[PDB]
Every structure is written in C-alpha cells, then in structure tokens.
Design an enzyme around this catalytic site. Structure first.
Site, PDB file in Angstrom:
ATOM      1  CG  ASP B  32      -1.844   1.197   1.258  1.00 38.83           C
ATOM      2  OD1 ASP B  32      -2.849   1.148   1.999  1.00 38.83           O
ATOM      3  OD2 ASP B  32      -1.564   2.195   0.559  1.00 38.83           O
ATOM      4  CD  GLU B 124      -0.655   0.560   9.825  1.00 34.80           C
ATOM      5  OE1 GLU B 124      -1.561   0.592  10.684  1.00 34.80           O
ATOM      6  OE2 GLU B 124      -0.673  -0.219   8.849  1.00 34.80           O
ATOM      7  CD  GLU B 133      -5.669  -5.309  13.361  1.00 32.79           C
ATOM      8  OE1 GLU B 133      -4.544  -5.358  13.908  1.00 32.79           O
ATOM      9  OE2 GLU B 133      -5.818  -5.327  12.122  1.00 32.79           O
ATOM     10  CG  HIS B 281      -4.228  -1.609   3.782  1.00 36.36           C
ATOM     11  ND1 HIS B 281      -3.459  -0.477   3.944  1.00 36.36           N
ATOM     12  CD2 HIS B 281      -4.205  -2.254   4.974  1.00 36.36           C
ATOM     13  CE1 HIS B 281      -2.999  -0.434   5.182  1.00 36.36           C
ATOM     14  NE2 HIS B 281      -3.436  -1.500   5.826  1.00 36.36           N
TER      15      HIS B 281
HETATM   16  N1  LIG Z   1      -1.612  -2.055  11.745  1.00 35.13           N
HETATM   17  C1  LIG Z   1      -2.457  -3.048  11.963  1.00 35.13           C
HETATM   18  N2  LIG Z   1      -3.755  -2.832  11.862  1.00 35.13           N
HETATM   19  N3  LIG Z   1      -2.009  -4.255  12.280  1.00 35.13           N
HETATM   20  C2  LIG Z   1      -0.611  -4.643  12.431  1.00 35.13           C
HETATM   21  C3  LIG Z   1      -0.333  -5.254  13.789  1.00 35.13           C
HETATM   22  C4  LIG Z   1       1.116  -5.673  13.901  1.00 35.13           C
HETATM   23  O1  LIG Z   1       1.559  -5.343  15.237  1.00 35.13           O
HETATM   24  C5  LIG Z   1       1.753  -6.529  15.988  1.00 35.13           C
HETATM   25  N4  LIG Z   1       1.162  -6.341  17.309  1.00 35.13           N
HETATM   26  C6  LIG Z   1      -0.160  -6.144  17.601  1.00 35.13           C
HETATM   27  N5  LIG Z   1      -0.409  -5.989  18.881  1.00 35.13           N
HETATM   28  C7  LIG Z   1       0.841  -6.090  19.470  1.00 35.13           C
HETATM   29  C8  LIG Z   1       1.269  -5.990  20.808  1.00 35.13           C
HETATM   30  N6  LIG Z   1       0.443  -5.804  21.841  1.00 35.13           N
HETATM   31  N7  LIG Z   1       2.592  -6.102  21.055  1.00 35.13           N
HETATM   32  C9  LIG Z   1       3.421  -6.314  20.028  1.00 35.13           C
HETATM   33  N8  LIG Z   1       3.135  -6.435  18.729  1.00 35.13           N
HETATM   34  C10 LIG Z   1       1.821  -6.308  18.515  1.00 35.13           C
HETATM   35  C11 LIG Z   1       1.134  -7.668  15.172  1.00 35.13           C
HETATM   36  O2  LIG Z   1       1.791  -8.903  15.425  1.00 35.13           O
HETATM   37  C12 LIG Z   1       1.386  -7.164  13.753  1.00 35.13           C
HETATM   38  O3  LIG Z   1       2.724  -7.402  13.330  1.00 35.13           O
END
Ligand SMILES: NC(=[NH2+])NCC[C@H]1O[C@@H](n2cnc3c(N)ncnc32)[C@H](O)[C@@H]1O
Ligand SMILES: NC(=[NH2+])NCC[C@H]1O[C@@H](n2cnc3c(N)ncnc32)[C@H](O)[C@@H]1O
Ligand SMILES: NC(=[NH2+])NCC[C@H]1O[C@@H](n2cnc3c(N)ncnc32)[C@H](O)[C@@H]1O
Ligand SMILES: NC(=[NH2+])NCC[C@H]1O[C@@H](n2cnc3c(N)ncnc32)[C@H](O)[C@@H]1O
Lengths: 343, 343, 341, 343
Positions: B32, B124, B133, B281
C-alpha cells in the site's frame, strides 16, 4: 474428552464460532449438489429410515434431521456444538416436529444419548475430505450405533492425480519475488525471498481446473465408515504409482473425493470430481517444490502422508519420483491455511 | 497478569498473531504505497525528530518503520513484535547491516522489558474504522517508556462519519436474508429464523469504497490525541453527532473513515483514508440501518455512535440515529470483528 | 336473473358506469390487433354470416355488429347493458344500417329476443382472460343459439409458464418494506409487515416482458365455448407439470391467452402471447411470496385454482412444488386488484 | 343515519373498500408534506393536547392519534369506518398505547362516543378540498366537541385562479377527433364526436403545472371549521372577480387549497399551492367550453357553484365573463370522475 484431547482450545473456539453464523449455514445449504444429493440418498432409501432411530452428527440448522423425518424416521437425535443448535431448536418447533427430533447441544464426544440408534447421518467432509478432522467425530459417534447400524455416508473415496499447470507453478515465484528487491523504500528485502516462496508452496490451492491438465488415471484411497476407527485417521498413508498417459512436467497432485450412501434400495453417490458440477468443496492441488519431467509410459511412484494436527487439520507430506529416471521431488503443506484461488 | 491478556481472550490472541506471522500479509500492507510512502515521508521530512534519538516501534512486523527511523539518523530503535514475524525482522536487520541500531525485542509490548526510555514512539496501529484490533491501546500503553519530552508518530487520529444513501447496498443485504423467509426449502420451513438472519446480516460493517456523492451532509469529526489519551479512554468511545442534511432522500446508514497526523518539528504530514483521497487497504466502512430514515434538505440528523471494546480485540458498535424534526429513529448494532468485504 | 344472482349490485353499478364512457370504447377500438383480427375472422369467414341471424353480446359501440353487417348478415341483435347502447343506435342510424342491426338494451341474461340465432359473436375476454366474468354471459347467451350454431370466438386457450425476474420481485418487496419501520415519525409499523406483504403479493402484475425470462415451455388449458356451460367457469382447476429448461429461481407464473375463430372458410387466431405484438390485455404474472429454486431437468407441479366471486372477478390460488426436492410455494391473488406496471 | 341519507350505497361500498388497502394508507403516509405538517402542528401546539380528550375522525392507520399521544393527550377516540380499523387496533397494541388510544370501528355519523372532547383532529381534505365530502363528517363530529374546543385543521381555504394552457385545451379535441373519421374499419364514427368532446370537458384535470400559466392573483373562499355547519357544504357558491395581470386566452380555472392549524402556541399552514412542493393532492383545473380573451387590467367575474351529490362528490358549475367586453363561457363538470393527467 476425546475432542478436547485432540484439539487446541484456540482452534475450537474459532471453529464453532465460525459455524454459529447463519450465513455459513446458508452457504452450505445453497450448494444444491450437497443438499440435493443427501435428500435423494435419504428419501430414495426410505426403508433405511422408516420408523428407525437416527443420529445426526453436526446437524447445524438441522436440515439433514428433517430429511430423515420426511423419510419416516421415528426418533432423530440432532447433535450440534455451536450456537446454531439454538436455531435448529427453533426450526424443529416451527415445523411441528418436537415429537420426532431432539436437539442436543454440545460436542458429539461429550453429550449423552438416551438410547442406541439404527443409523448415523452426517456431512463431515471438508476440503480434501479430511480437513476439519470432523470424520473422527462421525466415527466416534459409532459408540451409539447398533451392530445392525448403517452409516450415511457409508464410504469415502479420496482421489489424487498428477497434473500440469505451468502458470499456477509460476504464479508462486511471481508473488514471492516481491521480496527480491534491494531497495524497497531503501530496504533490501531479498533475504526473506526464500521464506516467502516456502510459505506459498505450503498452501494447498483451492479452486477448479480443466480435466485436461491431468496426466494419469487417479489413484483411490477408501475409508469405510462402517469399519474404520478414529485412530485410523490420525495417520493416513496413501501410496501411489501413476502410469503417465501424457508427457510433460508434473507440478503437483490434484485432490478430490466422492462419498457413497449404500442403502437397502440403492446406492447414491456424491462426487466433487472435476468432471462433475462444482461444489463448495471445489478441488485441491498441492504443488511440488520442483516439477518432475515424465513421459507417456513412465511411472510416478511415491506416497502422500497425512498427519493430523491439533488445529483440526493435517500436515501434508508428499514425495514423488519418476521411476525411469530417479528424478525426485517433495513438499510439505499446511491444510489448515489454504489459498482460495477460485474467481 | 499482563494488561494485554487481561483484555484479550486467549483464542483471539493466538489467531491474531498467527494471522500476522504470514509474510504474504506483510506484503499486502507494505504494497500500500499510500501507507508506506506517507509513513516514510512523515519520518524523513521530520528527521530532526529522529536524529540521534531513541525510538520504539510498536508492532514492527517485518520492521519497515524501524528502517525509516534508521534512515533518519536514530541512535537506537527498539522494534517490538509478538508474532513469529519478529524473527524475519531480525534477518532483515542483519542483511541490511543495521545490527548496531535496530534491536528486535520479540513479545508483546505490554510484556517485554525495554532497557531505557525513548524519545519517540512510532507505530502503524490503525485497523478498520481505526479502532479494530484494539492496537491503539497497545500504542498508548507503550507511553510508559516515553520520556516526558517525547512524541508520538502518529500524533493524533481523526474519525470522520457522515450519512449516506445507497439503496442497492441496502437491498443487496436484505436479499441475502430473504433466504430465511422460505416456507418450504426442500420441504422445510425456515421463516422462523428470518428475524435472526436480518440481524446477523445487518450486524456486518461494509468495507469497500464508494462515490462521495452518496454523502448527504458534511462529516462530523472525532479526534483522539495519542499524546494525551490514556489506554482506558478507548474501552468506551462515545461519538455524538448532529448532521445538517444537504440533500433529501433516504439515509441508509453512516459512512466511516479516518485520518492520522504526524505532528513533527519540521512539518505535519497527514495520512487520510477519506473517499476523496486515493484508496488504501483500509478502504472505508459503512454501517447500515436495518430500516432507512427519510429526511429533507435542511433537517438535522442527530444521535450517537458508541463503541464498546470486547475481549476479542474489537468493538461492539451501537448506532442510534434520529431526524429531530419527525422523531424517526433507527437503532443498530454491528460486530466490527466480522465485516463484509464487498470490494 | 342469472346475472344479479352472481353479482353484487355495487360491483355491477361501477362496472357498467365504467363501460358507459366513450373514452373507454376508444381505448378498446384503438387496439388494432384486437379490432383488426376480429374483422379478419368475420370477413374471411363471411359465409358463416351471409344471410344469417346474429347475436352480439355486449356490443359496446357496436363495432362487431358492423363487421357482421359487412359480411352479409340478415339481422344482428346487439345486446348492451350500459348506456353505450344509445351511442350504438346513433351509429347504426348514421351508417344507414337500421335494416340489419337491432340494438337491444339490457343484460343478455334478461332481454328477450324475437328468434334464435345462427352464430354468437362477442369480445368477452378480460385480463387473464377470465376477469369481468363475461365469459359466463357469453355462454349464457347460447340459450338463443340454434342447434349446430357457431361461436365466434370458438375456443379459448390459457397458457401458463414459470418465469424468473428478481427486479420485479424485490420491487414489490420494497413497497412492502415500508411497513417494517419501527419508528415512522416515531411509530412502530412493523406489526403490519405481514399484512403488507400479503396485500402487495396478491396483486397480479399486468405488463409485458421478454420471453427469455420464461423457464419452461407453457402449459395449455383450453375452454371450448361451443361445449362449455356457464357453470363450468365458477370453479376452474388447471393442473400443470412444467419440465424446467433452465436452472434458477422461479419467481412466479406468467399468464396469457389465445382465442380461435373456427369458421367454415378459415381458422383465425387472436393471441396475447409475449412472442406476439402487444395488445391492451398485456400479459399477467402472479408472484410467489418466496421464490422456488429448480435445476434444468426438474419438474414443477401444481394447480392454478380460480374461484369466481360476486365482484365479477376471481380469487386465484396457485400452489406449485419442485417434485424432486419438495420445495413448495402456495400463493393467493385478487384478480380484481391488479398492478399495472 | 346522516351519512347514508346523503350517500348512495354503491358509492359507499367502493369508497371504503378503496381505503381498506394498506397500499393506499402508505400512499398518504409517504407524503412528507401531509404527515410532517400534521405532526408539526400537533407537537408544536402541545399545550392544546396535553391531558386533553381528543377525537380523530377517519384515523385510517391511526397515525394522527399517535401524534396526539406524542403531544401528551390523556385519551384519544379514533374512529375509522373501513376495515383499516382492525390494523389500527394492531398498531395501538404493538405501540403499547391501549390505555390512551381506543379505536372505534364505524362511521362517525353512526358510532356512539361516551363523552365530549377538547379537540378534534382529522385529515378529511380531498381533491379541490371538497371531494369525497368528508369535510361534512369532520363538521358533523362537532356534536362531540366542547363549546370551548378546537379543530385541527381550524380553517380551510380553496383558491381559484384563471389559467392559460393552449396545449391542454387542444388535447381534448385531438382525443375526441378519433371519432371524426368516415371509415373506421368501414364504420362512420363521426356522429359520436360531439358526445366524445362533451365527455372530456366534464372531467376535471388532476395534475400540476407551471405557476407561469396563472393570469391573476387567486381568489380565496374560506371555511372556518369552528364556525361552519355541515349544511354549509351542501351548496358552495364562490363568487370571483379576477384582476388580470397578463393578457391572453383564459382556458379555465385552477384550484388548490390550504388548511391552517390555529393552535394556542402558533399557527401552522399546510399548502397544496402550485408554488409549493407537490403533494398527493396535486392541483385541479376545470376547462371552459370556450376560451375568453382578457387584457391585462380587465376583470373576469362570475361564480363557481359546487353542488354536493349522493356520490360523495360535487357537480361543478362555472360561469365566467370578461366585464370589459361582455364575453361569456361556462362549464358543468363531474368531480367524482376526474382525468388523472400527471406524468
Ligand atoms: N496495523 C495493523 N492494523 N495491524 C498490524 C499489527 C502488527 O503489530 C503486531 N502487534 C499487535 N499488537 C501487538 C502488541 N500488543 N505487542 C506487540 N506487537 C503487537 C502484530 O503482530 C502485527 O505485526
Ligand atoms: N461438514 C463440514 N465440513 N462442516 C460442518 C460442520 C458442522 O458440524 C458441527 N460439528 C463439528 N464438529 C462437531 C462435534 N464434534 N460435535 C458436534 N457438532 C460438531 C459444526 O458446528 C458445524 O455445524
Ligand atoms: N371484453 C371486455 N373485457 N369487456 C367488454 C364488456 C362490454 O360488454 C358489456 N357487457 C358486459 N357484461 C354484459 C352483460 N351481462 N350483458 C350485456 N352487456 C354486457 C359491457 O357494458 C361492455 O360494453
Ligand atoms: N383525507 C381524505 N381525502 N381521505 C381520507 C378518508 C379516510 O377517512 C375515513 N372516513 C371517511 N368518511 C368517514 C366517516 N364518515 N366515518 C369514519 N371514517 C370515515 C376513510 O375510511 C378513510 O380512512
């Protein structure tokens, strides 16, 4: 219980959450091959149901329990572990069948039935037949089946055949080569290219195909639901020796399945073969990491080994070899995470 | 006893991080160009905010953002990632000769232990409707490692909502639910579940793009300042609105998009998912009314959008809409975790 | 009399008021397919009228009686129960045919005629053929018909065929969704959604359509006016068994009709089929409240039951099922309240 | 009863059959001008309803009784003669207002109401305001009104204005000239042309038009519903003297109507004027049999005499003259059978 012994809680929560949705029931119900053929199998064999006791393993909304009622069944136990059981109960009431159908919420490995049954009906087939590992619940339910009892479906045939599809094989490296650039916004990604390729080849491809891509008569592995036990499905070893009808590069193995309802009046077949009308099961193709050249008359020998996992699916191990040259290839696939390629 | 596990069902967490362990999903996000290009612009154009500074990258995935901070002269970057993608990040750090600057720290940001406080946090964390999420809470939770003089990139987030008309979309969903009005599907009466079906189908947020001319009023804006906000602020999000209708017709629901701003020392860079901007996206989100509301040009449409965070890393959404002149009211609930991807 | 016994006075008043308007006579006469085919049937079979006694049931402006005069009829009794009868007399006098056409004001079930006739002519077809219940008046008039006399038209064919048309479906479902509103100006209307869908789907849809929406060859139900007795049209039971040609959703049944003028010289057909040029009858379609699915090769069985009511129309009952699957659809329609689309 | 003595039974049967249809109630309820204004006049004059006794004449589905309950009425008697009353009883029960709204099935001239009411509400206006003769049922219900009660609407104004429409006048003879041919399939029809012309001119034309065809400010005839007796509507003589603002040929008279809800807080107006949004009442035009030339500044004087008939309608006698020239024309129209010309 047997179910929780073989399943990660995380996998089960999402599995039964998925099937609690009416849109998914509607999707399965609207497959006319599926729903039509089951209804025909039950109704055309009315003698196997008239005044009998029936068990419906994983009834969802209960549609198969109603066909058994239309066939003249006396008592039908409909077992369903998701929240769809609540909706099945509503439909039993609204259809004036509370006297003949009893909805039992829960897992078939954990509920208790009040009596033995004369016949078990179910629709436990997933992708490649075995995905979801629900056939083990179908077989597990045989603890309630009288020695007289029949199984609907009665048998299951897995078919595997070598195919050629140069464009499907090439598509994998086209997608993976996203990582093979030394300055994506100033970042060299090329170190992860091999990992991306590996990830793509580990996915079984779900879609359909022209039968002309097949290069040899299929090999058939049969499961007899009247005789098999749950343990027989923890490790499914399918040897094969294909006698090549065409010359060309073999890029993998294509999979489909049939089931038969062997009744007293007739046997009815439900086929997902690429020669039959499409169903929501489509077909499944597992690519080889490297294609194998074979010529008309050669033999392609090997084994397809399915190893059940606690995520309600199987790890697929395929090894194949051209006997006339010793050229060999293999691959490992995770059936839980397939690539849905159909358009 | 971690903040993460206390707000997350284990089943949801396992699947969440398995989903993001896939390189094919990293490719989708990285490809993206609007996302990846704007993030790089915000970081490089504000390089003074990163030169010789300590950085924390929350949910680095493959590590792209950490590489941008390294390009801007960051002295040390701690890249936290809880999925197996963390090991892929390490590979790219080594192959890009940045081992002296980028330190991958695997695990959840609520559970790892950083060696020092940081000057700036980058992430992000935006999902669909911004809040899906629940990663904004992890983003804010990371401020325990942020110096009092520090900054957040993104700095603020704007949620925009506006009423729309789209009879085809409304009829498209009501069409799917009419399946459960059937009085005799293969002889079974399904009509008893028509109510349950419509509720389920109209609980699905519609993720796709649309023409801006379906919007019937100027959007309302709800702003979240990530420097000021606290984790607990996102457990209940109440967004009142009062639209001044610019056109007459049927209001079939509310449209949603979001913008984020990287408020740096040199300039403010905006990243927008609005329907007037190039598609991302994230697309846009539309919540349907089970019953459309009619309003004339000049009327006012007022109500509240209320999001309640649930243990499945998502939000339960209730939307009440009322045209003040006539009292015509529409109450709707939506499951933001399970949306309809219509594109 | 027979007519008053089977007719609410309230219905008869409005009925004959409606047909007392010259504008409505202009509408029927300007249907060139209707008017041209009747003239062709009569003139081409001039021997069946030459020097014969004629009865024209419900003559309106009298157009069919003039056609019989052109074919050489010696005497034509033209019966008309509306006030249009006096307009017919004006035309008879201005066309100098007082010696051949004799307007008889009144209902054909109540007037006296000097003698028996050799042939009866009439245009009694309504929407879906049977609406208005004038076929019974046409048959009742056979009390004036000599033995071996003829009927123009001689027979009537009803054609049935299933169709698919999701737009027409969700079009009538849209109008009905108005009564699902739980807060129309603050009022919960949803309690009446059931009554709204019923009312809206009892209306026959009068309009034309592309023949390609039909999912099977039509089934034919014939009425022989030479043989039928008016009592036969009180309860009409039409069984059907379609052999599906295409897979898809059956949204209802489409109706049209043909009539045949079986004369001594020639058999002339007047058709309102969708393959034929459009007429003022159009075609009729009865919607199911819930569509049925069938694959090509399946058989759709059922019956269309017409019960004549005291409002000069019929109550329609259509029950159809997919035999292979048991998928069934029962639907009722008020032919008196159509939807002109 | 008073109703039956002034109405032919045949006319009454069809009339109340027509209004027994939900599709017709929706047609009136979907007119936002009608429903929105009635709601506004009632709610914005809440003091005229709070804790009052109300009578809804011809409630139909009961929509106006609900508005009266929204305003805080203590008790509402809702009278409806058609079978729509049974549907109204359903909505009363489903909206939990059985303690405030009582549906009385029958004609207001025949039912027995126990007590006197504080205010009467109704929507009895038809084409040209007077068609259907329901205003007499509205006034007849004042036998239940306290001497200090009120009427919503309080007054009704019918507006008359001369118009020019050469196309409309000529359209009549183009249709009637169908009969003026000597050989229609061999038949001379010309003897009936005069009868066809006459028939078309006795029909008022229901449709809208551009205000620019009006040739003078309208003349207004008022019915004060608090003052009038139902006998005042048996013969409505409307004298008019129009001051021509434009020069041209006057082909007939146009009709629309306004009603006013004179409440204690404010006066709300409902207009069907051609200068206002279109309603399901449209407007009505009656043609002169011969057009009259009038110069700007001339005066067109005469009378429009409406004579009620036993068919719930009126015979319209119009007579006009140009005062300065002495040119006269007239016409005698049957309002019960209008020509719907709108497209
Ligand atoms: N940007 C998004 N909408 N999603 C991406 C989430 C990304 O962050 C990571 N992630 C999400 N929550 C967490 C957390 N609490 N701690 C570490 N990594 C995280 C996940 O594994 C993915 O690589
Ligand atoms: N046939 C398929 N591939 N999927 C349908 C599975 C259906 O059976 C249900 N189901 C699956 N396993 C079980 C089980 N052990 N016990 C009860 N119901 C089950 C599931 O909830 C869904 O309704
Ligand atoms: N073909 C149609 N759909 N309608 C034609 C009916 C015409 O016959 C007249 N008509 C209908 N029924 C009768 C009757 N029983 N007796 C005499 N005239 C009749 C009616 O006035 C009109 O002129
Ligand atoms: N406003 C209009 N132009 N027409 C509305 C007529 C409505 O009033 C009802 N109505 C008409 N006359 C009466 C009456 N005398 N008594 C009761 N209801 C009546 C009729 O049933 C319908 O619901």
């Amino acid at each position: 219980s047997v179910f929780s012994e073989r399943t990660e809680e995380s996998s089960a929560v999402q599995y039964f959450q998925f099937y609690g949705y009416l849109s998914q029931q509607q999707n399965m119900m609207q497959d006319y091959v599926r729903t039509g053929t089951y209804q025909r199998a039950i109704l055309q064999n009315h003698t196997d149901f008239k005044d009998k006791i029936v068990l419906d393993v994983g009834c969802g909304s209960g549609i198969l329990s109603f066909f058994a009622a239309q066939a003249g069944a006396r008592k039908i136990y409909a077992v369903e572990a998701s929240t769809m059981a609540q909706h099945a109960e509503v439909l039993v009431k609204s259809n004036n069948l509370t006297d003949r159908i009893v909805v039992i919420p829960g897992k078939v490995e954990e509920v208790s039935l009040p009596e033995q049954v004369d016949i078990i009906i179910s629709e436990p087939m997933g992708y490649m037949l075995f995905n979801e590992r629900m056939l083990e619940s179908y077989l597990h339910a045989k603890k309630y089946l009288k020695p007289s009892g029949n199984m609907f479906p009665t048998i299951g045939d897995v078919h595997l055949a070598p195919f050629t599809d140069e464009q499907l094989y090439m598509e994998q490296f086209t997608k993976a080569n996203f990582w093979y650039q030394p300055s994506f916004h100033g970042v060299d990604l090329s170190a992860l290219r091999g990992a991306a390729v590996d990830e793509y080849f580990r996915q079984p491809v779900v879609d359909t195909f022209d039968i002309r891509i097949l290069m040899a008569k299929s090999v058939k592995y049969t499961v007899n639901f009247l005789e098999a036990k749950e343990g027989d499905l923890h490790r499914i070893e399918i040897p094969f020796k294909f006698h090549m009808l065409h010359s060309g590069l073999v890029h993998g193995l294509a999979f489909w399945f049939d089931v038969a309802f062997i009744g007293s009046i007739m046997t009815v077949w439900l086929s997902t073969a690429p020669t039959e009308p499409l169903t929501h099961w489509y077909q499944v193709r597992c690519l080889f990491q490297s294609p194998l050249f074979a010529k008309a008359g050669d033999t392609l020998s090997g084994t397809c080994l399915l190893i059940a996992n606690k995520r309600q699916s199987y790890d697929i191990s395929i090894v194949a070899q051209v006997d006339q040259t010793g050229s060999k290839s293999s691959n490992l696939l995770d059936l839980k995470n397939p690539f849905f390629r159909y358009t």
